[PDB]
Amino acid sequence: GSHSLRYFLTGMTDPGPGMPRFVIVGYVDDKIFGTYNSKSRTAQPIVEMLPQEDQEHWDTQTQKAQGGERDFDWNLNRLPERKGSHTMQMMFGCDILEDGSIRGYDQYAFDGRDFLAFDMDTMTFTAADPVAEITKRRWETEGTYAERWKHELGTVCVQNLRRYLEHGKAALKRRVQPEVRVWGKEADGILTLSCHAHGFYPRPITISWMKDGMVRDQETRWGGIVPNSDGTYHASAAIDVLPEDGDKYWCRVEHASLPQPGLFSW
């Protein structure tokens, strides 16, 4: 029922060979819809999601992102005395809930630690420590950031979320069934059973092991839900059992693309 728009912005003094020092990745729900980086200097849609974008919209995104790049440059070249490389990060966006109400998000991190956040509902800032507190008091007193980001989060982000939901609706709604593989390896006297779910979309999934129809959570390991390059996902679960009992174990997979949960054996 609810939908989400999120931007992930990274500035780096040491991104590594051939890598851009500033990057933006935009997400609509569980899907990358566009990106920007300091080498191309262009904000560009993911065409498999947004196949018919107009240049006017992305001209605007490019100019806003280039402004973000300069701000991250400005900050990274101005860190207080508070060796090594440094990073700036920002995550912002909005939720539209099922009844149309809105939630905004806006948080910064320095060297990977919480730094400053902005809450649009109360128009207040939160500083994560006394150094951030200097920035918060300046931003509050200056009196302009709060109004700008109320607008950005509660109006611009919402408008763009609805646009990407409509323009990208074919990609967002197409369910992709997981291809499931179970296999076992006999290490010493232990038989390790693996259950991998390949290539599913949307992202949410569950994988559980069962023996004699009873779930077996105590000794299960899960690898997590991780991305494929094509916008589908991968997930895994493993369990260790005696080689004699390898036939009694079932991996149960639940996914929106599966009318009923699927059961798989070795």
Binding site: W74, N75, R78, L79, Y108, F115, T135, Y145
Partner: peptide, 5 residues
């Protein structure tokens, strides 16, 4: 976001 100085 102009955070520092």
């Amino acid at each position: 976001g102009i955070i520092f100085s």
